[PDB]
Design a protein around this ligand. Structure first.
Ligand SMILES: CC(C)CCC[C@@H](C)[C@H]1CC[C@H]2[C@@H]3CC=C4C[C@@H](O)CC[C@]4(C)[C@H]3CC[C@]12C
Ligand SMILES: CC(C)CCC[C@@H](C)[C@H]1CC[C@H]2[C@@H]3CC=C4C[C@@H](O)CC[C@]4(C)[C@H]3CC[C@]12C
Ligand SMILES: [Ca+2]
Ligand SMILES: [Ca+2]
Ligand SMILES: [Ca+2]
Ligand SMILES: [Ca+2]
Ligand SMILES: [Ca+2]
Ligand SMILES: [Ca+2]
Ligand SMILES: [Ca+2]
Ligand SMILES: [Ca+2]
Lengths: 582, 147, 582, 147
């Protein structure tokens, strides 16, 4: 009902031209410095441009990369809603084709932001800060004026840009903050990615020292239903004190999922309630009378029908709000749960142990299609969550109206009693499914099963073969109640765990065809074959001792020959695997 | 360098496998120089031939898995488990007198191959002779495990 | 449109009185003979009545028990359809309560049929044959007259009783056939259930002799797409030459499932096509014109609308026939597949091996709720299949109209083109999901992955971290296509394998809450703890040698001491488990 | 009674477990008489005490697992694997002359416990003396494995 003209939008067509002129310069400046520093693998193996931040480091600071992907995802959200958004200076060429290259446009535009972190010098952060000042400057100035927008909702683009604002603010408090750390000569250090931190050393230290905390304590005891409120804490515990740091590609995928949860929860609320209050206002009771009289019965008092139809459109709005707040809470509970399970999956794949040994009994081998699944694991995580919030809300919406219109209202008020004329006409029938299932459990523990010496339980036969024959046609009617439970409990479990990748929804025997669990294993297999935290700590002792260091070395060898013996005495089974492998 | 469980050895068995692509169980120079290149650094080939020489004690130019284990076992250990070196003394000494002879030493190599020549065995004990006697103290084996 | 009066039905109220007078006598005759034979566990441990045929025998002849359960299931099918069927001489007492005790009535009525097989004498088969003559006599005579019945269909009760007729005919060719075998003095033998057949002896023989066929042959080679028509034969092969016989309770459950498949396939066809031909005849084109003119557009030629609406009600009848014949074929394919997998599950549970060791690593212990799942496993198998044919047909019906009304008709005729105005308006869009997924697979195998000596493949880094960043927003749009595939492939797999018990539909980690797989493991656990085919062959050497058989026995002991040595020499690891367990 | 794989022994390990509910690894009389009752028969307690006596060769009144294995190994075997008894002769004879002495016999019991008294060892060889010599033939060990 309001339309703002915008001097920012009239300049946004030139801010498309301005910023893309800035981003093209800084990329080619970094092409000059790479021909002035004799860099490692960080150069492009096809042209020579810089790589962005190294993904196969576990000790690298992950504030920049989580920030930039958190911005690049939000521009995808706004791009779907606005139909037009980039016709601006290029040809359309069958306009739906022009809604494609914008997928390749935003990562090109934000590319010099990540590119500064790979150098750690006075050049990078000065160029890095001013760009993060600029994008934070343009967005905030666009939203101070014109908050009300006629696209979707009266406040939508303001609330739609709340992650994208605050995530650029993290770039503004990091590039000057890390430039200020250059006073301590943190720019004379180099891009050695195996820089022996305390993390790599303490992780090997945790393996060998472990024998002294291996001595266990006692066990505690908690009573009923508070341990049940404590075993749920045991699934909450993502915390525990550990020398363990995530991969970079996995750490991005949790936050980018968390932004995607925020965007679907806003799109569902602010797309439905506008078309509900309008009906709640514009009731047209004179017209809804003829809408009633053409199909159904007035049933009394056409004035009171205003009280009637409103008293149901309360409950449609109450249901659809409760459906989103249920579905948003569950996926919030799952990504927290998906955080602790990435920890235990990844330590168990260090050992080659018997946890994920359904495929870890085979060879670690970085094949071709293992690598494509790694290229773009973060996108799969945030894509399966947006479909999660769609289906879960569409299901729970129909699962609460079935409760509200059938058991909640009649216990509250008592208008319609449709189920209690069904269950009230089967009240002797469901007794016999109980009593026969009662007589099978009761007669088993007290007559057939005979606990004996050693608590070993045998059976009093003969009479049992009869009882499993009298109850034959009864147990078919129990077999229908378990039949609908198998269908239900598979439905709930397929939707709750629908937005997770670490878990396969199919059978044990056919896990490899579920495409979600397929791309997660091939991620986690190539992550351990490249950056294992023991061989990356091992080269630290061979590098930082080499750069900082006869019969005298034979005395070192005389210690070395004894330390070979001191290991083999306390480790017997290695002696065969020494002599067969010497 | 002490007693470990199956799991604690299983990881070092795994990280060893990421070097030797042969599956043979040993690391050559070119089997090493590819991994150092993969983490960025370009070492000197003469330096890499020196870098194996710290690890390899048999002098065959190649690295065994217990040769790989002791490198990580030295420098990340605790200060001392005083009983376990005292637990080690029951195998190195049949006498119980605490004094480890060259004859009591070669009994252990008899159990574990006797891979080295006896002159090199004689060069071992010439390190442990700061006691002023030519005889292995209770503490001589201890200081060799510390440093 | 026809109504038969029935002199059988007017006598069926007395045939209810007649047969129940016969069945009560023969049960109490067997109570007299059990006080004249000093029987084993076959007596009731609460009263003293006979048990029916022993279920925990693997060598007992399974023609009787499969026949009687095949009759007892069919009476349940007819009982649901007729609302009234037993008001006849007893009180109604809230009539829906009177539709309950009939579940306990038919196994009481057919009880002396199974009870004859547990004696093997001249008394049993003479009494057994005449009863099987009688029930076969009454049913056939009821169906010679009055085939046409106004209940459901013109031929329904004739086609509805085709298993129940022919399954009583097996009782008529078994009880006189086994009575005729009594000429060879097969009634002087006893009810020793461990009767050492060739089965128990050859099964132990297959274990020990196995070392001589353990020498393997070569392997064959077949080209493409005929091996694909041969690996499907490898799932068909239920055949192979083996000394292996099913449990009795498992062997019943396949046939009773096969009858239940026949009954749902008849109820769906003969309940829907009557209400379809009537509309195909009684079109009322003058009335359907006003049915058309009140909602939609005539669009031409109200005479030709007769050709129009008929040309769609061809396809509704063609779809619903094809939906049943698809769903009947799949469950036919699954029970054949469920037959071979019961074989391999059961041999693998003899070993305690590493196949079903998700629970076989724990203790074999016949607990209380393990026994209830065994009591009535056959009912669960035939209950989950009737729900299988319901849902599978309801789903496939909606999955073919989506094909017939959208791709089949327009390629055939070309009236409506609803999808090809959707896909025709995205023809450049889906190219880029291909080309980016093309460029990830192509550039990986030819630039990054470097096969080296020993076929060990490493990667050319640096350039790859860039490519997994340019393609970030593209891979979200690939992540939606895999998102709907995860939802689809879980749906198909949940319906195809819905009528199986040997397979858990939930995750690996939560199999134990699926109630179908729960009752199957607790079956198969108590089946092996009672009748293992090695200890049941072991007691055969201790029984049939005891009834048919100093320094001379010390010479037998001198052979026995040497045979202890001959085993321990060729089996080294048992020596510790001999001396620690002596 | 010949060499078996792990699986072929795993089943007999399983069926043995269905008798002894103790987990101790041996079968008493009452641990046996319940199973015979479960398959229908009611044997005489004096007969069951005789029925163990065919299986038990150590005479301790209880049945071991290799005592359980040999009962099923006797009567369901093939006729002969002539090489494997010839393969057995390399352990029972150090000489290679084919003649198994009582001194060559006690070498095997030395390897496997020497559980029996030597008079009972002497009573073993008195069975194998149909050769007319008092010395174990190549065939004497063979006929003991057949019958
Ligand atoms: C509870 C259900 C059966 C009620 C039906 C809901 C409606 C919306 C239909 C339409 C599409 C259907 C969904 C599509 C496919 C799946 C994925 C499967 O892994 C779980 C069931 C689930 C999620 C279906 C449930 C039922 C469904 C959601
Ligand atoms: C293919 C589907 C989604 C289309 C929807 C079909 C209609 C009939 C709805 C109504 C009830 C729904 C079914 C009820 C529950 C289940 C069990 C689940 O383990 C697989 C999906 C399945 C079988 C649903 C599929 C969709 C469904 C069949
Ligand atoms: Ca090698
Ligand atoms: Ca070496
Ligand atoms: Ca000494
Ligand atoms: Ca000294
Ligand atoms: Ca015992
Ligand atoms: Ca014994
Ligand atoms: Ca000899
Ligand atoms: Ca002789």
């Amino acid at each position: 009902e309001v339309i703002p003209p915008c001097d920012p939008t009239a300049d946004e067509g030139l801010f498309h031209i301005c910023i893309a002129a800035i981003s093209l310069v800084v990329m080619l400046v970094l092409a000059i410095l790479a021909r002035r520093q004799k860099l490692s693998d960080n150069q492009r193996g096809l042209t020579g441009l810089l790589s962005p931040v190294n993904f196969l480091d576990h000790t690298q600071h992950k504030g920049l990369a989580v920030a930039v992907y958190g911005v690049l995802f939000c521009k995808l959200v706004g791009m779907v809603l606005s139909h037009h958004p980039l016709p601006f200076t290029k040809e359309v060429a069958n306009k739906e084709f022009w809604m494609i290259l914008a997928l390749l446009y935003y990562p090109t535009l934000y590319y010099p932001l990540l590119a500064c972190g790979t150098l750690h010098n006075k050049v990078g952060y000065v160029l890095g800060s001013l760009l993060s000042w600029t994008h934070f400057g343009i967005l905030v100035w666009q939203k101070v004026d014109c908050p009300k927008t006629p696209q979707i909702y009266k406040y939508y683009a303001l609330f739609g840009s709340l992650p994208q604002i605050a995530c650029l603010a993290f770039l503004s408090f990091q590039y000057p903050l890390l430039l200020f750390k250059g006073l301590q000569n943190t720019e004379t250090a180099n891009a050695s990615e195996d820089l022996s931190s305390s993390y790599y050393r303490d992780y090997v230290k945790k393996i060998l020292k472990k024998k002294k905390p291996t001595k266990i304590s006692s066990s505690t005891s908690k009573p009923k239903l508070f341990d049940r409120l404590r075993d749920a804490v045991k699934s909450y515990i993502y915390t525990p004190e550990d020398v363990f740091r995530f991969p970079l590609k996995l750490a991005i995928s949790v936050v980018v999922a968390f932004i995607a949860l925020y965007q679907m929860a806003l799109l569902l609320i602010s797309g439905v309630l506008p078309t509900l209050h309008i009906v709640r206002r514009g009731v047209d009771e004179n017209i809804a009378f003829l809408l009633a009289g053409f199909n159904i019965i007035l049933s009394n008092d056409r004035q009171e029908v205003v009280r009637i139809v409103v008293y149901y459109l309360w409950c449609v709005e109450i249901c659809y709000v409760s459906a989103v707040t249920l579905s948003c809470l569950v996926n919030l509970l799952m990504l927290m749960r998906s955080m602790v399970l990435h920890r235990s999956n990844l330590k168990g794949l260090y050992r080659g142990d018997s946890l994920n040994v359904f495929n870890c009994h085979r060879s670690i081998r970085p094949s071709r299609p293992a690598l494509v699944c790694w290229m773009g694991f973060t996108s799969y995580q945030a894509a399966f969550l947006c479909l999660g919030m769609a289906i879960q809300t569409l299901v729970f919406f129909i699962c609460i109206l079935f409760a509200v219109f059938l058991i909640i209202i009649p216990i509250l008020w008592g208008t319609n009693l449709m189920l209690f004329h069904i269950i009230g006409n089967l009240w002797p029938f469901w007794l016999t499914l109980v009593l026969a299932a009662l007589i099978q459990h009761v007669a088993s523990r007290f007559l057939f099963i005979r606990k004996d010496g050693g608590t070993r339980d045998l059976n009093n036969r003969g009479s049992l073969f009869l009882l499993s024959y009298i109850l034959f046609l009864v147990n078919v009617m129990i077999g229908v109640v378990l039949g609908i439970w198998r269908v239900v409990i598979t439905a709930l479990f397929n939707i709750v765990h629908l937005g997770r990748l670490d878990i396969s929804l199919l059978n044990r025997n056919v896990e490899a065809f579920d495409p979600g669990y397929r791309c997660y294993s091939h991620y986690l297999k190539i992550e351990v074959s490249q950056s294992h935290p023991v061989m990356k700590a091992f080269c630290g002792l061979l590098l930082q001792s080499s750069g900082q260091d006869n019969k005298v070395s034979n005395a070192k060898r005389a210690r070395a020959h004894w330390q070979l013996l001191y290991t083999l005495v306390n480790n017997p089974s290695l002696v065969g695997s020494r002599k067969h492998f010497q | 360098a002490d007693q470990l469980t199956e799991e604690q050895i299983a990881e070092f068995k795994e990280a060893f496998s990421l070097f030797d692509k042969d599956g043979d169980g040993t690391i050559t120079t070119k089997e090493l120089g590819t991994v150092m290149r993969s983490l960025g650094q370009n070492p000197t080939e003469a330096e890499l031939q020196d870098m194996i020489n710290e690890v390899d004690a048999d002098g065959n130019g190649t690295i065994d898995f217990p040769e790989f284990l002791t490198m990580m076992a030295r420098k990340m250990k605790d200060t001392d488990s005083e009983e376990e070196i005292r637990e080690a003394f029951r195998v190195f000494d049949k006498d119980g007198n605490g004094f480890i002879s060259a004859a009591e030493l070669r009994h252990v190599m008899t159990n574990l191959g006797e891979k080295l020549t006896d002159e090199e065995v004689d060069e071992m004990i010439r390190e442990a002779d700061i006691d002023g006697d030519g005889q292995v103290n209770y503490e001589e084996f201890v200081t060799m495990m510390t440093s």
